[PDB]
Amino acid sequence: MGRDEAGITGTWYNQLGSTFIVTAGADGALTGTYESAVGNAESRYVLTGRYDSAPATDGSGTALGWTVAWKNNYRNAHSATTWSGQYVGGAEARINTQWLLTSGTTEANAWKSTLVGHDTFTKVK
Amino acid sequence: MGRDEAGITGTWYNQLGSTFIVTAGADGALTGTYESAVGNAESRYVLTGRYDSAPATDGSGTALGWTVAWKNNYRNAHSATTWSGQYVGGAEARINTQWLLTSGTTEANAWKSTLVGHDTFTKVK
Amino acid sequence: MGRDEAGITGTWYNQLGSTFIVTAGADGALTGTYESAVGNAESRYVLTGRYDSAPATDGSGTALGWTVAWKNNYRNAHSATTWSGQYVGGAEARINTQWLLTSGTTEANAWKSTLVGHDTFTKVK
Amino acid sequence: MGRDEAGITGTWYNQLGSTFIVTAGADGALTGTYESAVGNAESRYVLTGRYDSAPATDGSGTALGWTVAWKNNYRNAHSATTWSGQYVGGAEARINTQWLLTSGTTEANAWKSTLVGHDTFTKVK
């Protein structure tokens, strides 16, 4: 029922070699797992998010976002990343994102709590 | 079972007058609703996210994040915001966040797709 | 000749206790020194930037930005911060900024090169 | 005298087709002009910034930043962009940046004042 429900659902890979496995629900839900190739992380972590299930039809992307808290049964990096971006469908489908990675800190160190970057996900490689 | 499960769960308000209603699950889940005082928005929107259910005990905050896609039964702003931040417990509990608001755009306009800002949530006002 | 040349020029302090000393030139230039209360820093560092010397008159802020590279005669933190924001004049003048702090890294660590945050500068305290 | 003074100085192009013309001073200064291929802009605008004139030698990049206020003799977009990033030398030299573009706004619209994105500059194309 979601316009890009089928186009978003599946396995995605970014430029770092991370793997994003997502299911897009008819209603706007995103659920899945994330495995980072880098950082204080091992194996899969739960993700959840949301996407625009009725996007504009005018060649525009589909807005979406999701979160990973970096705790699983193997490790806890006391941090969470949120990706915010858009899905662009077609032969070379992509999800283009910017992210914010916040660590738990003391109040004295909160100024240095948050990393920012950008990931591009593709269906191959 | 989550360390700040009780401290996070409930109603939060930010500096804009927005209202965040969240339940924190024992496992790391965040679910709830968001109502923005500003922007292309009306009434409540679904949110989901994650938090560190076993944070450091050393005076450090609790990392968390969540997403809203700005589609509900009233409006669709073809956009999604992700907040990334930390919960700081105590008499004056706060959630301190930075956010990324991505709009669906054409590829030609993707350079101007994403707003960034910061919200502080409190339990009063 | 700059509309807020007089309002911007002078000494500013942020919420961390840092001190920003700036001169605004008629043409749009910003020059001065920055002293951070936090981080890998001591004493003053050179800053340069730019501001909108002919802003809108409609109650709107004045856009501006500036950079500090964190090298001086005392220390080198192999990093640079840029603040991007707006000057809001009046009894309680403020400069409201967001910043990006990039460290030199290897290519393998570039994903974790860049911190993001927000500073508010006032003329007192 | 700056380690990458020679490597930074010159003409750079980003993925949008914008042109960055910079001189790096021995002392850490960056001066030049920027011409954007997109947005509310025409022709060249003054830029100034700073870079780490004595970077780490260990395969690490060179931290730098610069600002453009989007006022010149042709147009005034009441905004400023700051790029924060690192120069990576070698056969395929690059400057990898993240940026913050703040517009002057009323206080009521300040939540939507600031765009964020990422530009990669190369010496060709």
Q: Tell me, what CATH number does B26's domain have?
A: 2.40.128.30
Question: Position of tokens 């009046």?
Answer: C90
Specify burial of residue C58 (Cβ count, 10 A radius: 0-12, 13-18, 19+): exposed
Conformational region of residue D17, where left means phi above 0, alpha means psi within -120 to 50, and beta covers everything else: left
Please report, for residues A101, A116, C106, D4, D86, the alpha-carbon distance to residue C113 in angstroms, rounded to integers and kept in the order given: 12, 8, 9, 19, 9
- CB under 8 Å to A5, separation ≥6 — which residues? A24, A25, A26, A53
In chain D, positions 60-89, which contact chain C (CB-CB < 8 Å)? 60-71, 76, 78-86, 88
Instruction: Provide the β-strand partners of residue D121.
Output: D14, D95
Element (H, E) at A93: none
The SS3 of residue B101 is strand
Tokens of A71: 């705790």
C102: closest CA among C84, C75, C82?
C82
D15 vs D111: CA distance, rounded Å: 28
A13 is in an annotated binding site: no
The SS3 of residue B69 is strand
- CB under 8 Å to B65, separation ≥6 — which residues? A67, A68, A69, A80, A81, A82, A100, A102, B49, B50, B51, B82, B83, B84, B85
Residue type, A43: S
A66 is in an annotated binding site: no
Q: Compute, in degrees rounded to 10, the torsion defined by CA atoms B102, B107, B112, B117.
A: 20
Question: Position of tokens 């739960």?
Answer: A46
D60 vs D63: CA distance, rounded Å: 9
Considering only CB atoms, B115 lies closest to which of D16, D39, D112, namely: D112
Most C CBs within 10 A among B14, B99, B118, B120, hence the mutation to make, goes to: B118
The SS3 of residue C111 is helix
The SS3 of residue A116 is strand
Instruction: Domain of residue C46: give its range.
Output: 1-125
C51 is in an annotated binding site: no
A20 vs A33: CA distance, rounded Å: 6
Please report, for residues A101, B49, B50, C76, the alpha-carbon distance to residue B32 in angstroms, rounded to integers and kept in the order given: 22, 9, 12, 46
- CB under 8 Å to B125, separation ≥6 — which residues? B13
B64 vs B25: CA distance, rounded Å: 12
A54: closest CA among B72, B109, B101?
B72
Q: Establish if B54 touches chain A: CB-CB under 8 angstroms.
A: yes
Q: Do residues A70 and B27 make contact, with C-beta atoms less than 8 angstroms apart?
A: no
Q: Do residues A31 and A47 make contact, with C-beta atoms less than 8 angstroms apart?
A: yes
B63 vs B96: CA distance, rounded Å: 10
Specify burial of residue D76 (Cβ count, 10 A radius: 0-12, 13-18, 19+): middle
CA angle C48, C50, C54 (to 5 degrees): 155
Tokens of A24: 């897009």
Q: Do residues A47 and A34 make contact, with C-beta atoms less than 8 angstroms apart?
A: yes
Considering only CB atoms, B16 lies closest to which of D39, D111, D113, namely: D111
Q: Do residues A73 and A46 make contact, with C-beta atoms less than 8 angstroms apart?
A: no
Return the residue of C nearest to B98 by Cα: C117
Chain C nearest C-alpha distance from A94 (Å):
19
The SS3 of residue B105 is coil
| Cβ neighbours of B55 in A, within 8 Å | 78, 104
Element (H, E) at C124: none
Q: How far is CA A25 from the centre of its chain?
A: 15
Method: X-ray
B44 vs B56: CA distance, rounded Å: 33
Alpha helix (H) residue ranges in chain C: 5-8
A72 vs A49: CA distance, rounded Å: 18
D113 vs C41: CA distance, rounded Å: 30
Q: From the CB of residue C59, how many other CB atoms can be counted at a distance below 10 Å?
A: 12
Termini Cα distance of chain A: 29
- CB under 8 Å to A34, separation ≥6 — which residues? A18, A19, A20, A21, A44, A45, A47, A68
Binding residue positions of B for biotin: 34, 45, 83, 99, 111
| Cβ–Cβ below 8 Å for D115 and B117 | no
| Integer-rounded Cα radius of gyration of chain D | 15
Please report, for residues B58, B62, B66, the alpha-carbon distance to residue A106 in angstroms, rounded to integers and kept in the order given: 8, 10, 21
Q: From the CB of residue B17, how many other CB atoms can be counted at a distance below 10 Å?
A: 11
Q: Establish if B95 touches chain A: CB-CB under 8 angstroms.
A: no
Q: Where are the beta strands (DSSP E) in chain B?
A: 10-14, 19-24, 29-35, 45-51, 62-71, 76-88, 94-103, 114-122
A39 vs C67: CA distance, rounded Å: 28
Element (H, E) at B5: helix B5-8
Q: Are strands A94-103 and C94-103 parallel, antiparallel or unpaired?
A: unpaired
Element (H, E) at D73: none
Considering only CB atoms, D16 lies closest to which of B16, B38, B111, namely: B111
C121 vs D20: CA distance, rounded Å: 30
Return the residue of A nearest to D118 by Cα: A118
Instruction: Give residues after which chain D gaps, C-N over 2.5 angstroms.
Output: none
Q: Establish if D98 touches chain A: CB-CB under 8 angstroms.
A: yes
Return the residue of C nearest to B85 by Cα: C117
| Cβ neighbours of C100 in B, within 8 Å | none
Specify burial of residue A116 (Cβ count, 10 A radius: 0-12, 13-18, 19+): buried
C70 vs D55: CA distance, rounded Å: 11
B78 vs A59: CA distance, rounded Å: 13
Tokens of B52: 């560190």
| Cβ neighbours of A118 in D, within 8 Å | 98, 118
Q: Are strands B114-122 and B94-103 parallel, antiparallel or unpaired?
A: antiparallel
Tokens of A118: 């950008």
- CB under 8 Å to A97, separation ≥6 — which residues? A83, A84, A85, A118, A119, A120, A121, B102
- CB under 8 Å to D33, separation ≥6 — which residues? D20, D21, D44, D45, D46, D47
Q: Do residues C51 and D69 make contact, with C-beta atoms less than 8 angstroms apart?
A: yes
D88 vs A34: CA distance, rounded Å: 29
A8: closest CA among A111, A119, A123?
A123
Which chains contact C through at least 3 pairs of Cβ atoms less than 8 Å apart?
A, B, D
D75 vs D51: CA distance, rounded Å: 28
Number of domains in chain B: 1
Tokens of D125: 């194309």
Chain C nearest C-alpha distance from D118 (Å):
12
The SS3 of residue B92 is coil
CA angle C116, C117, C123 (to 5 degrees): 145
Exposure b/e, C84-99, CB count within 10 A at least 16 = b: bbbbbeeeebbbbbbb
A80 vs A65: CA distance, rounded Å: 13
Exposure b/e, A58-94, CB count within 10 A at least 16 = b: eebbbbbbbbbbbbbeeebbbbbbbbbbbbbeeeebb
Most A CBs within 10 A among B27, B78, B119, hence the mutation to make, goes to: B78
CA angle D121, C31, C43 (to 5 degrees): 100
